[PDB]
Symmetry: C3
Subunit: 447 residues, 3 copies
């Protein structure tokens, strides 16, 4: 009388709630709310850090992303990731417009479909504002919204299915990704690098010669963003057990400690490299690097190793940021360095420190990693993170370039010398007051 | 040995907690905390949107409202709405100063009195800062606080009882109001219109001729407010089941989707009406309109209809805002257009799309609306929303006018030409710095 | 097969989760997240209130404190407070680096070790940013971080053990401290007074003669801080039951009401003392005073007495702030007046109003206070708050002075007249822009 398909049964004849522990559902409902406030967190963070005045306010853009992503998820995003009749590479349109999404056990069986929909939808939205922030410089809004809908559909949704889906080939292969380091962070990072390399401003003056590595538009914005992100990450990582067990709280302790050691580590590196300065921007980026690092690992690794997930990503991401000098590109490179590089490092290290007895805390069964002499685990992590990077860079490139050849879908004006025109363009962007301007400052052309 | 009255029994002889599912209580406790942060959310929103410099900071005023409303609720607000011995129009003073408020099942039987008190108290506080924001222009603080205490007592509390109370006549009549669209939004909106029409500044220059429809004091404030409100609304709507079932999470999905489609819809309307501009203020107002729209409906309607609750309120509220031109009044009209008009539209539409099988998800029994060929439901919604609008406008008018004839209770100086006096009044309000001024800039008169 | 020691048992043979109610764990997990956002709350509050421009941004410093405190807690802070093999004055290094912290019932038996670790760790972090804010004026960052690690280890951890530990002598003596008014507020306040008296700037011009009592750096910052603190305090106080019972929600109602009456009370006192001005800073400080006041009491006293916990601390703390005039010291005195004095008053009053039938709501057994003719309870409170004040002032003094005699550990330059040097020092601090400066403005000396 509980069917385990469609709606899960007839509400007029059964209590669909009897299939689930109530406390499990409450923790996952709460966690969903927490992940949501991470979305403006991303916006405040990349708005503040910018070494350039972005015409588009990313704090505002975070609300736009929340709107676009929620409609995409409802329309067919959810179905494409978490339908029960999927192949090994993709879901279906079976839950188009959330049809029959109710009380059947979700692919995470301790919660029903409708709760898993709510939870996982927040993950797609966080990824959308990361993507929007990566390609925001001189972006046209219309094209940006279209781009996000397309990118969530053909880049986020396939990768998410491989990672989390019923018959996802990475699931079947035995690759570990606790809280979606692959679909969210690694994914958005390498999509950001496609933006940088194809549409980013080349020979950029903020990224060339002896200019300061850190030159923030707004420190108070960076801090507010980091606050929202660290606060929300308890639901992001802690809710990825799908339950109310103590593995949830174990994963929260790991999240806190990786952030803390990441923050301190990056600020220490900067101290050595500057000859004794204390970096305010760097402490914040280090916390984000630890959070990203521990994401694929938080419910799999022992508590004292969570420190390594703060330390090692902070060091490597800190140096990765220097590649902006080498390439002389600024646009999009911060998101690649933190989420792309940090996601890769964290996914790799999970292969080293995953432990079957950490997973077993709530009955979850894994072979483990190098901790349990499971050497081959490292190979499973690499196949995951290489597949994710390859698909993300390639398909994001194809979308950017294809939209670039269509005049009314082009995301960024090509900027391909009238004295009067240059004076006007400068003043157009310089005089704008985002605080009081009721309208988006749309990129301006020769007409 | 569980009495079901007063305190519910003797703590020294029974565990009063045995009467309730623990997960139910945890979700409602959590939801209470969430609703609380909506209070500064309202303050930041209406502070930012203002086309005029308000002498009173509404962000600060939100904390004042939290103080006044919590004391009023404790004193007799709770008793007047949720006492167990009420008539059909009002409660009693039986729980004066929260006497014997403990472990008896509340009128929402899945939680005890003391938890329902906490939860529903947040609803009264949200309504108080909406009211304070509606009548803040040139308000005197002393009179404003008194006004709020009186207005919560004789306007909020009767309407809330009709909607939610043990023998409330709207409850008995079969009108649907899931999360209090009536007591909170519709109520505060039509009380706002009474302020506009009786005390609002007439022939206002920001609302007359060809002046810009949107001219915000602070965009970053609007965005921060919208963030807090959308975040908190998960508890506002999701906790209105009184339990931990999947109807709670179903209602959260509806809340997210209505906000998203409301945001996109209002920004699209503005795009047509401006000939291609992207409205930053409008995206935010559209999200608020959807949230308001879905409030009476969130746990009653099917997921794909939640889109309509974003779209239709966004369009109608957008045009309602133009009535400010027609009347040449600005003061108080934003709250009427969003909460008054949006609450009305959402209450009406609930009569159309309510479905007994959506309610049945957690065992709740309703005849449903037009979805279940229950045509008469639309008539029940209209009687609710007309009663609410009539009582709110009339009794708020009477309070405003009565306080206006008492010199030391008058809320706003009548402003009924010395050259020197006008220069001084202008400079008084212009020179004030809210960031650093330790005191409220009290309205200034000829002495 | 549940051992009740070390890890609590073998995860491969038992479900350690069977020992606990799931709803209990979910509420305490949620509460932990809430307490965390109180940390930037403290930072925003004391940044905004300052009558001086602090070279160190306290909003930023709150994230630093979160990093340092999380690492200290992991390293040995947790072990020193909540190890199961402690003496009567201190814990052990048994859980060094969180070794074997998992599934054994914690000293609060309704939650496991790993969840109690997470929860109580937030309390240590809140105390760390209070301490950092108290001694931030002209602080050198390196020394400040070292200082925090040392102070949490030898001041916070002993006092916390006495209050909360397995064999803590204050626990055994029967002193009541519901949510840690002793370890957090009283403690940090009297440590702040040691800073003021030993390192604070003497004959300070902002604290001398006829200068304004309130002269805030940023009102919007005070308000944002108060918002985060009041929001988080629901977890701070509500989670101190260790469970999901209605005593948790009872304690939340008490928290809300004490804040509200504290806010209104302080603003009323200021109104009398200024001859009719409305104090924006004072409403906020009054809310904080009530929150502090009700902290040792929230789950022990009857609801209508929670009003007294707002009123009496607001009055006394308001006058305590005047002692800054008497001493002509500003540095560190705000934290003493609010948390030191307010913690003392609230601890004292708990001895008066504690009621065994309030505790009994969830089965907790106490003799009660003067409500249950238990006169001796007042003596137990005094011994607690005198021990806490004595240990905090003395050992903080010794740490400050000892670091002051070591050139590279000195927290504040001694400031012990070149015309050119004075012009330069003035311009150094005046010209700094915290919004855009990528580095901490380190105190500057003659080289
Ligand atoms: C499910 C989510 C989907 C939401 C809706 C998506 C709609 C997007 C389609 C593109 O729309 C165009 O985008 C603007 C570019 O941003 C256009 O140009 C506007 O902006 C300038 C571009 O900078 C132009 O030069 C024009 O002056 C001005 O009309 C604007 O007219 C509009 O036609
Ligand atoms: C349970 C919640 C209730 C909380 C307490 C409510 C108390 C309110 C009563 C009214 O109080 C008056 O309000 C001020 C007006 O705002 C008065 O004028 C003050 O403000 C100016 C008005 O603009 C005046 O001209 C005077 O100079 C100045 O004394 C002030 O003196 C005070 O008498
Ligand atoms: C577990 C948490 C622990 C985290 C790490 C703690 C490390 C703290 C040790 C002290 O470090 C010193 O602190 C700076 C003082 O703040 C020093 O001077 C720096 O700052 C100026 C002091 O104002 C000096 O004059 C110098 O120019 C400049 O090098 C800096 O070099 C560094 O040696
Ligand atoms: C780079 C760091 C990778 C850590 O890899 C180590 O390799 C295993 C082998 O060198 C260690 O011993 C592991 O070897 C297993 C096989 O005997 C045992 O069961 C032990 O429990 C287990 O510590 C294991 O701890 C782990 O730290
Ligand atoms: C304005 C939009 C209002 C929608 O009202 C419709 O009216 C009912 C009649 O026209 C529809 O059929 C309803 O009629 C019931 C009576 O047979 C059936 O049981 C069906 O389930 C049910 O779809 C119902 O869906 C509903 O959409
Ligand atoms: C300063 C304010 C301290 C309040 O102390 C009072 O003292 C008790 C004695 O004066 C009161 O009666 C208490 O005395 C007990 C002994 O008979 C009874 O049981 C009553 O329940 C109890 O109200 C008690 O309420 C309490 O308010």
């Amino acid at each position: 009388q509980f069917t385990g398909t469609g709606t899960g049964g007839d509400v007029f004849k059964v209590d669909l709630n009897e299939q689930f522990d109530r406390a499990d559902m409450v923790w996952i409902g709460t966690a969903s709310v927490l992940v949501w406030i991470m979305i403006p967190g991303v916006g405040l963070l990349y708005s503040g850090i910018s070494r350039k005045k972005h015409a588009l306010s990313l704090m505002w853009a975070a609300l736009m992303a929340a709107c676009v992503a929620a409609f995409q998820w409802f329309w067919w995003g959810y179905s494409l990731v978490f339908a029960h009749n999927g192949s090994v590479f993709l879901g279906t349109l079976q839950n188009f417009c959330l049809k029959d999404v109710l009380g059947a056990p979700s692919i995470v069986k301790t919660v029903p479909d409708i709760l898993f929909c709510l939870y996982q939808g927040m993950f797609a939205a966080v990824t959308a504002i990361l993507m929007a922030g990566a390609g925001c410089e001189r972006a046209r809004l219309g094209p940006m919204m279209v781009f996000l809908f397309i990118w969530l559909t053909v880049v986020y949704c396939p990768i998410a299915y491989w990672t989390w889906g019923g018959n996802g080939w990475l699931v079947s292969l035995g690759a570990l990704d606790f809280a979606g380091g692959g679909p969210v962070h690694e994914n958005s990072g390498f999509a950001a690098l496609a933006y940088s390399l194809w549409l980013g401003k080349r020979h950029d003056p903020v990224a060339k010669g002896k200019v300061p590595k850190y030159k923030p538009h707004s420190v108070s914005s960076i801090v507010m963003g980091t606050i929202f992100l660290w606060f929300g990450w308890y639901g992001f990582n802690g809710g990825s057990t799908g339950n109310s067990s103590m593995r949830s709280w174990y994963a929260c302790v790991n999240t806190n400690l990786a952030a803390a050691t990441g923050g301190l580590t990056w600020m220490l590196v900067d101290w050595f490299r500057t000859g004794g300065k204390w970096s305010t921007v760097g402490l914040c980026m280090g916390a984000i690097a630890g959070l990203v690092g521990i994401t694929p690992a938080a419910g799999y690794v022992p508590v004292y190793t969570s420190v390594i997930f703060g330390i090692v990503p902070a060091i490597i991401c800190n140096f990765a940021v220097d590649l902006k000098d080498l390439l002389q590109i600024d646009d999009g490179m911060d998101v690649w360095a933190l989420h792309g590089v940090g996601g890769f490092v964290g996914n790799f290290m999970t292969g080293l420190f995953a432990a079957d007895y950490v997973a077993m805390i709530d009955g979850t069964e894994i072979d483990g990693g190098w901790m349990n002499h499971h050497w081959k685990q490292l190979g499973y992590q690499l196949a995951g993170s290489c597949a994710v990077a390859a698909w993300s860079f390639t398909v994001t490139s194809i979308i950017l370039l294809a939209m670039d050849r269509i005049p009314f879908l082009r995301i960024r004006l090509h900027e391909d010398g009238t004295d009067l025109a240059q004076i006007g363009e400068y003043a157009y962007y310089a005089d704008d007051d985002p605080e009081t301007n009721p309208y988006v400052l749309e990129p301006i052309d020769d007409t």
